[PDB]
Design a protein. Structure first.
Lengths: 240, 233
């Protein structure tokens, strides 16, 4: 191949379990989520994968997935770059609610609309929201401009703030021939996948990336995939 | 007043701290890992906040940092790794206990090596079990041939650590970044010797405790305002 690139969605989180919308809430991995990451790492190790640089978000579910993979592959010494721009989509006022609470309050017609829409954002997270201070006042976002700090995001917004990091920080590493590992989130990784494969808005919203499973890309000199993405793992986890 | 915190990793596996672990990439033992947890809890209890972290490229230091950041809920922090904060490269002595060192190289050289501030140990011979494990490890592939150590005296170690402190760490402190450094006895010695203006003799007698946060208050010139303080019960 011309360039090798590996992507991985964080393993299952404690809130994925509860079916609670996390978004920018910094939920940790569940024990099952940790094992997923560990197994993904062992799959990367059995295949003899080597990286030169790692990108991740500022969210511990992604960072811990990266740590567990680096540990399994004996590459804890690699440089690791964190950015809010790889964060999960900001779910606004839905943050902290489970799916029952969401349906109860908004009705399933509205949930379906949000679910199937590329560019309609959920309600904004406002100053009386239970997680407002927890997220908006977190010092990790202190350097964001007023315009950059979302009160909510559509998938399109998420992708819009994710791609500039890909373009400016990841692409140059790849073109240098550095072997890149990105440990992040379903929606931030969709931005990358959509961009690589030129997927439609409809198709990307159908793309469901599984937690803790390494995704492998082989790109041409124009960073276009030469073949479709491939999942790494034992034959079972791969099939499913 | 600037706040700087240092932490030295604890016990590594297979008694390797007593076997010139040096540049061999030994992991923490479970006890060494627990030390890091307790160190991290102290930092949590005290409410310490950091803005950036520095560590070596050796997993025992890196795992110490990871354990600390986890404990204080600051896993989102920027982390910078450098060979320049590595332990001393002990060359041919690496992996050997005290008896084996004496038996191999004799009591004469052994005595000199132990008390000397600037006499390097001998480099690994091609039959050393760590020979290719260390010298061909790709984490050092960017090093110039003359940057790539094969064996270091304490002086050599301090001399390649201080440029990193000056060029990379000092500027972060001056802009008010709260720095955490997780590293090794000998690389931390370099930093302490420079901060406190210690002599060769004094630094070789300074044995920094492991697994415990070492706190410095620094003035505008990065000069310590008081003796190093330890956090904990
Ligand atoms: O409600 C949403 C949703 C709402 C607003 C924007 C995007 C989505 C969205 O993308 C989504 C949803 C539900 C489910 N299935 S679920 O009801 O079982 C569900 C799972 C986890 C959290 C909330 C759950 O409800 C999905 O698979 C989705 O991809
Ligand atoms: Cl890291």
């Amino acid at each position: 191949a011309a360039y090798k690139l590996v992507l991985i969605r964080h393993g299952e989180s404690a809130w994925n379990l509860e079916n609670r919308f996390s978004g920018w809430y910094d939920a940790d991995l569940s024990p099952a989520g940790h094992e997923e990451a560990k197994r993904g790492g062992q799959a990367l190790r059995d295949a003899g994968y080597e990286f030169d640089i790692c990108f991740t978000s500022v969210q511990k579910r992604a960072i811990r997935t990266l740590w567990t993979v680096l540990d399994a592959i004996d590459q804890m010494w690699l440089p690791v770059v964190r950015t809010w721009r790889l964060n999960e989509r900001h779910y606004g006022g839905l943050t902290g609610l489970n799916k029952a609470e969401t349906a109860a309050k908004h009705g399933e017609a509205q949930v379906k609309i949000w679910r199937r829409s590329y560019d309609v954002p959920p309600p904004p997270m406002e100053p009386d929201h239970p997680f407002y201070s927890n997220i908006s006042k977190d010092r990790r976002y202190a350097d964001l401009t007023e315009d950059q700090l979302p009160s909510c995001e559509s998938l399109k917004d998420t992708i819009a703030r994710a791609l500039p990091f890909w373009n400016e920080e990841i692409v140059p590493q790849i073109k240098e021939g550095k072997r890149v590992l990105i440990a992040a989130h379903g929606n931030s990784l969709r931005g990358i996948v959509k961009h690589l494969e030129g997927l439609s808005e409809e198709a990307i919203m159908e793309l469901n990336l599984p937690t803790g499973i390494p995704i492998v890309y082989e790109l041409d000199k124009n960073l276009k995939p030469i073949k479709p993405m491939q999942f790494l793992g034992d034959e079972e986890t791969v099939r499913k």
